[PDB]
């Protein structure tokens, strides 16, 4: 019932991501150089070290706001994937079943932490 404890859980789990070498496309922010129609198609760029950022400076209320943005992470990659065979859209599918596998505790913990508070 610990309402803090998704933190460090989040925490832990983008360690985990930043080590996966399915993360290596998602760890920065796209390359507008690289891509220069991105902003075209994409409204809300959304990367890893903006998300760790985000935590670290204590901008996120709930592991539910977490998992907005890890989300939105993929879902920029889905809509800006020419393929759905492309090889940076298929790493993100790997890295979010990953994603969805540990943030599902996180999230119920947290929920169950915060209902138990509101007892
Ligand atoms: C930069 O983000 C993405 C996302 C998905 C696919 C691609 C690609 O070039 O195949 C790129």
Same mark, same amino acid.
């Given at each position: 019932?610990?309402?803090?404890?998704? #933190?460090?859980?989040?925490?832990?789990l983008?360690?985990?991501?930043?080590?996966?070498?399915?993360?290596?496309?998602?760890?920065?922010?796209?390359?507008?150089?690289?891509?220069?129609?991105?902003?075209?198609?994409?409204?809300?760029? !959304?990367?890893?070290?903006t998300?760790?950022?985000? /935590?670290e400076?204590?901008?996120?209320?709930?592991? !539910?706001? /977490?998992c #907005?943005?890890?989300?939105?992470?993929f879902?920029?990659? #889905?809509?800006?994937?020419?393929?759905?065979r492309?090889?940076?859209?298929? !790493?993100?599918?790997?890295?979010?079943?990953?994603?969805?596998?540990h943030?599902?505790?996180?999230?119920?913990?947290?929920k169950?932490?915060?209902?138990?508070? #509101?007892?």
């Amino acid at each position: 019932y610990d309402i803090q404890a998704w #933190k460090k859980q989040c925490e832990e789990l983008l360690n985990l991501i930043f080590q996966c070498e399915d993360s290596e496309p998602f760890r920065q922010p796209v390359d507008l150089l690289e891509y220069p129609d991105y902003r075209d198609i994409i409204d809300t760029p !959304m990367d890893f070290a903006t998300v760790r950022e985000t /935590l670290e400076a204590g901008n996120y209320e709930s592991p !539910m706001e /977490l998992c #907005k943005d890890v989300r939105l992470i993929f879902s920029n990659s #889905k809509a800006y994937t020419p393929s759905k065979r492309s090889r940076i859209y298929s !790493m993100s599918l790997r890295l979010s079943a990953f994603f969805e596998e540990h943030i599902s505790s996180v999230l119920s913990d947290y929920k169950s932490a915060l209902r138990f508070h #509101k007892r």
